[PDB]
Structure formats: C-alpha cells, structure tokens
C-alpha cells in the first residue's frame, strides 16, 4: 500500500555538560534504517537496517555532512530561540525537526513534510502547498520572516517533491523483502475471571507489520467504548508489533462478545469468539 | 537520503 520516509532530529541543550546532544533517526514506514549520535565516537551516520549497508562510501560521506550541518545549526538556534522567548539563563531546552514524504503503492508522490517544535510544542511548520510557513507564535514569526528572505520553502519543496521520493523509491526496491511485505497478526484470546460474577476478556495480536492495526470489541455486533481498555501498539523488538484490547464482562455472557481485527496483511477482517 | 538544502539558521 502507501509508503513514507521520515527523518527525526532531536537537539537537547545541557549546560555544564558542554555542547548540546543531537540524535538523528531515519525511518521507512515503521522501520528505522539510519542514525547519528553527536556523542558517539564514530562521528558518522551509521546503518541500522540491512539493505542500507549496501550504499557506497560516497553515500555515507554525504549523509554525515547533512546531519553534522544541521546539528551545528541547532546549537546556535538553541541560543537564538531562548533569546526569542526572553527565557531564563538556567535550564535545558529541546529543538525537534521532523521531515519527509509520502508515496502511493504505484510509487507516485502524495505529500511532503517539514515541522519544527521548541520544548515539546510546535514552532514553525511547512504547509501542504510547500510554499508557505505557519508560525505557532511571535518568536516563530521571526524565523518565518528570516526564512522567507532566505527562500527556505522554495528549496524545501525541491527536496520533498524531488530527491525525497527518488530516495524512498530506491530504498523500497533495495529492501523489497523487508519493506514491501505485510505479515498478518497472530491472534489469540484469553479469559481472566476478576470476580465470581465478572471476567476480563483479552483479545491479542502478535507479530504484525506495519504498525497500523484496529482491535475492536463488539457486543452483538454493536461496538463498545465502555470498559474497553486499549494498550498502545508496542514494538516486539524484531521488527513486528504487538497490541491487546480487553473488556470486563459479566460471567456467562461471553458468547455475546466478538473481537474485530483490521490489518493490511489480512485477506478479510477477522472476527473471534470465546 | 537526508536533506542537504536548506540548512539555515532560525
């Protein structure tokens, strides 16, 4: 189906412990593939997926530069932004960048991204048109005007519409076996009597790719929200994902309940009874 | 492949 490439940059200031920390992570859908740690001894972009290892030294040289240029910008920006907000000398701050693109199952371009956040909340964001910006506030407005005088959006659209998709297309083909695949969930169901008149019914889903899954509890086909506990989709660690949805029900009324499973790797949506 | 342009100050 649909595919995406996302790069995540985290720069955290740390006074006393010298210059700030910069972590860079690369993603193709729900698969991490590249990484940069400004604290690591290598001082290079390193592989984290098998198919990216293939890429030449000229590739790895380029990636190192781009990510080093960005971290060095972030160190300055961490100071500049603290000034923009008229903030206090003492404390650690965070700058978060997220960018990348979306493609179709055909490979055709869908959307480009560039979003920035200072201390957990939005700062500056590139609109879907990839021509304009959105300032979260007045400090963000300074960057907005600075970046309009620098033709940032113009240069950003060039990457996102161009090279971002060319790179996504390349990776999707090279790592075809691990990326262009959909392994369905391994569903099972458990009973836990929490009372002599009540019991917790858990609907399980193990080892599935990608992360997009939908687990719903239906009493006589009618979907429930009440007593429906839902855990956040957690990574197994081997590249697949896990998720459970449980509901507390009265004893003897187990037959009225079904768990409806929706995943890309499934030929038909699953329906399970006790 | 990571973005190389623009990498400009805020």
């Amino acid at each position, epitope marked *: 189906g649909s595919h995406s490439m996302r790069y995540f940059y985290t720069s955290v200031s740390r006074p006393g412990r010298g210059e700030p920390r910069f972590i860079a992570v690369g993603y193709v859908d729900d698969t991490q593939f590249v990484r940069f740690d400004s604290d690591a001894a290598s001082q290079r972009m390193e592989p984290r997926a098998p198919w990216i290892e293939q890429e030449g030294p000229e590739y790895w*040289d*380029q990636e190192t*530069r*781009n990510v*080093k*240029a960005q*971290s*060095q*910008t972030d*160190r*300055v920006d961490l100071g500049t932004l603290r000034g923009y907000y008229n903030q206090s000398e003492d404390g650690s701050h965070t700058i978060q960048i997220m960018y990348g693109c979306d493609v179709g199952p055909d490979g055709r371009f869908l959307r480009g991204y560039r979003q920035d956040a200072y201390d957990g909340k939005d700062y500056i964001a590139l609109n879907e048109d990839l021509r304009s910006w959105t300032a979260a506030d007045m400090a963000a407005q300074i960057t907005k005007r600075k970046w309009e005088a*620098a*033709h940032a959006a*113009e*240069q950003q659209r*060039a990457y996102l519409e*161009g*090279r971002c998709v060319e790179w996504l297309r390349r990776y999707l083909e090279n790592g075809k076996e691990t990326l262009q695949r959909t392994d369905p969930p391994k569903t099972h169901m458990t009973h836990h009597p929490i009372s002599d008149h009540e019991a917790t019914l858990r609907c399980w889903a193990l080892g599935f790719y990608p992360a997009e899954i939908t687990l719903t509890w239906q009493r006589d086909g009618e979907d429930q929200t009440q007593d429906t506990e839902l855990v956040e989709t957690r990574p197994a660690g081997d590249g697949t994902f896990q998720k459970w949805a449980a509901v507390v029900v009265p004893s003897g009324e187990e037959q009225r309940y079904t768990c409806h499973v929706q995943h890309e790797g499934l030929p038909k949506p699953l329906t399970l009874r006790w | *492949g*990571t*973005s*190389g*342009s*623009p*990498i*400009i*100050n805020r």
Partner: T-cell receptor, first 115, second 108 residues
Framework: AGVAQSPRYKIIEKRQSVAFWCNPI?????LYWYQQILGQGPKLLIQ????????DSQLPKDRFSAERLKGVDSTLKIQPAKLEDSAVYLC?????????????FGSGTRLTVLE | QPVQSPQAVILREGEDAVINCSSS?????VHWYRQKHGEAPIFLMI?????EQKGHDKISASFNEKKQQSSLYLTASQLSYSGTYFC??????????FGGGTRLMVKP
C-alpha cells in the same frame, strides 16, 4: 561589506608557521577554505556550519588546522609549512546550505614558502 | 571531479564561444565563477532544476539533467571577458568541487 581576508601576501621559510585569518559576510552560517595551486581549480580544505566542522576530509591534518570558535571569523594554520603549500588561500561564505545560494569569495592570501 | 571542455580559448573581440561542464554523477546545482588577474573569483550564475537556463549581464548558461552537463555561452565578446571561468558542482548540501577552468583571452 564583502568577505575580508588577511594578510594579502605572506612569505614563510621552509619549516616556519603561518595563520590566515578570514571574516565572512555578516550572518553567513557557512564558511569555506579552498586552496588554489597556480591558476587551477580551487580545492576544498574545510567547510564550517557556525562553530562546527561539516567536512575536513580534504585537510592535510599532519600540519593544517582550522578554527571558527564563535562561528563568525576563522583562522587557517599551517604548522610546519612545506614548499608544496605555496598557493592562494581562498575563503568563501554562503548564507547556509544552500542549493540556491552562490559562494562569496575573499581576495585570498598568496603564500610563498621558500628554501 | 567535473570535466571542463576547453582548457584555453583565444577569441577575437566580437566573437562567440561556449564553455562545457560535464559530470559522471547526477547534478544538484551548477555554479559559474569568473576569476580575473590575481583576484577573487566573482559569482555569475547558479542553476538548479528549477531552472535551468539563466543569465548574468550578456552571458547565459544552460543546465541539462539527462545529459549531466552545463554550458556557458559567451556571445559578442567584450575584451573585459578575460580570463578564467570556473564551474562548480553542487553536493546534496551544495558543496563545490571545481572543474579545471577555462583561461579565456580576448584579443582586440
């Protein structure tokens, strides 16, 4: 304004030491050091993004050193010099990186290392 | 790494000449600089995919993606057109790798 480069010309003996100072265009985040032997195509030495180093792969680290501490002006040092070093040392500046930005070069420092 | 077509050209003022820049690896941005005497190379044009064909004074340059090449067109020379012309190659982060150079002398 323009990129400032000091000195204009420099004379150094075979194994002596020398520093080349450079001030970029005001507010420019990117700073470059190129070496131009005779009239030929300038060759990259080091690239900067404010206080830090983006690429020093082409630096003969056995003698060459470069620092831009406050992310403004920079100083390229050769310790000790060699007769192979006599060339024009060029410094350019870009607003950042840059696909639409053209470099702005300084007049360069002509160094002549002698016997 | 870029390859410059004529290393040296001696034109008679009023004549036209083309400088060609070649690349083995795909393009990003192509820069053109003119260096006179013992002085700093002055910037002429930068070309990206967004465009492609551009100008500086009476000099025009073209960028071709499929051919992985850029050419500099000098028409009706002005004798002030001397001397060296360099083409720069753009990295993903725009980091110049200069071509050989074209030492152009215009005779009046």
């Amino acid at each position: 304004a323009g990129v400032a480069q000091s000195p204009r010309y420099k004379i150094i003996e075979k194994r002596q030491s020398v520093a080349f100072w450079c001030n970029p265009i005001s507010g420019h985040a990117t700073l470059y050091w190129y070496q131009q032997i005779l009239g030929q195509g300038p060759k990259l030495l080091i690239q900067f993004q404010n206080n830090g180093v983006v690429d020093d792969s082409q630096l003969p680290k056995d003698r060459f050193s470069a620092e831009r501490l406050k992310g403004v002006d920079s100083t390229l040092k050769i310790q000790p010099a060699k007769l192979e070093d006599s060339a024009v040392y060029l410094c350019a500046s870009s607003l950042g990186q840059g696909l639409l930005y053209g470099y702005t070069f300084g007049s360069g420092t002509r160094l002549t290392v002698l016997e | 790494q870029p390859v410059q077509s004529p290393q040296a050209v001696i034109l008679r003022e009023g004549e036209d000449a083309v400088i060609n820049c070649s690349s083995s690896k795909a393009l990003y941005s192509v820069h053109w600089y003119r260096q006179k005497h013992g002085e700093a190379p002055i910037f002429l044009m930068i070309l990206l995919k967004g465009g492609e064909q551009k100008g500086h004074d009476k000099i025009s340059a073209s960028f071709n993606e499929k051919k992985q090449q850029s050419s500099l067109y000098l028409t009706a020379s002005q004798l002030s057109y001397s001397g060296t012309y360099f083409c720069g190659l753009g990295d993903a982060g725009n980091m110049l790798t200069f071509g050989g150079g074209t030492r152009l002398m215009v005779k009046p």
